[PDB]
Design a binder for this molecule. Sequence first.
Ligand SMILES: [Zn+2]
Ligand SMILES: [Zn+2]
Lengths: 67, 20, 51, 45, 121, 45, 45
Amino acid sequence: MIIPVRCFSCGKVVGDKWDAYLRLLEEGKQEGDALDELKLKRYCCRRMVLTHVDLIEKFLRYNPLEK
Amino acid sequence: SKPATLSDINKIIFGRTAMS
Amino acid sequence: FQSTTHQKLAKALSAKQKKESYARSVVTKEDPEERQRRLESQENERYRLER
Amino acid sequence: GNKVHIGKVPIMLRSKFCSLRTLDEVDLYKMKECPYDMGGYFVIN
Amino acid sequence: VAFPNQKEMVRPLFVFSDSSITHPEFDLFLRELDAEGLSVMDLRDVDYKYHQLKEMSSRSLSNDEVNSIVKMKQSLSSNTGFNTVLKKAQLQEELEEARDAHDHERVARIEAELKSIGAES
Amino acid sequence: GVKYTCGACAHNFSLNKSDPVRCKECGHRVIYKARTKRMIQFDAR
Amino acid sequence: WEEPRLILDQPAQHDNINKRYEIRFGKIYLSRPTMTEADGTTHAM
Ligand SMILES: [Zn+2]
Ligand SMILES: [Zn+2]
């Protein structure tokens, strides 16, 4: 839905690296190289960012219910 | 037939929000 | 196959079965049951008058 | 002798006779319909 | 509306202020009425107006009145996304009716109208 | 006395248990109750 | 159109007059789904 704050396995803060990851992917870096640049060494933390699906972007396309 | 006071006019205040 | 008659026959028979549309669309502006209830009301009125 | 109403037939969603067939992606969102929904069912009651 | 000293004026609703009328304002209004030679509204008429406002504010609208108000605001409605989608759907239904009736003239006008209304972002 | 919200144009109004359930301005037939005023607390866990 | 003709006959004798009464079924017309409210109005569903 939205990027988790902490890694499930070890608890490293990964919630501040989503926009930087998207930026690095925009510049043309490979996903593994982008994860290396963000200093995500353990594959438990790499799984968190590599397999995340951003569903909040789809939820935000519906009109707000209160104004 | 008595003249209307200030409070009598204040009772019938109809605001712009009430108008809308 | 390359004969013009065979090609024209194949084209005609292929495009003949492509056209298939029987039902025609329409726009409803009012309740479809309005006629039934108004005619039932008129029939009940004339039944009362006849009785 | 004219059009007589003979009944109401339930409509399968996303078919040629459904209202959502034409709607594009934006109006589908405005209609509170999910774009991932595929249709193929009926809505009875 | 009309000032006593001045002449008649047609004003929109938003010009009025929600703030209460002050004492010098009412005093000046009374002086203008005396200058023109008019009187103030009677207390019986004040009570009648108050009852009219309370009845109108506490009234319960009927279905026909609500539909009339909705139609009036729809006439006033410049644009609304839900209403634009509904109008486009109704136009599409009218277009398929015209196409199924082999009316080559109406369908062009409906297509032009849809093109004008459409092209969203 | 009780606040509501329209399901289409998100307009706020009130009802007195005697009006028809409808939106005032756009006439939608679907309305939603407003959130309460009581205090809402969560344990952040 | 499977059974397009209902037929009623009556050889009335009450001057023999053989009367046949028959009704034919024609075209089918369909519309987009519509919703009819209690107050009598209709709108697209
Ligand atoms: Zn980890
Ligand atoms: Zn509304």
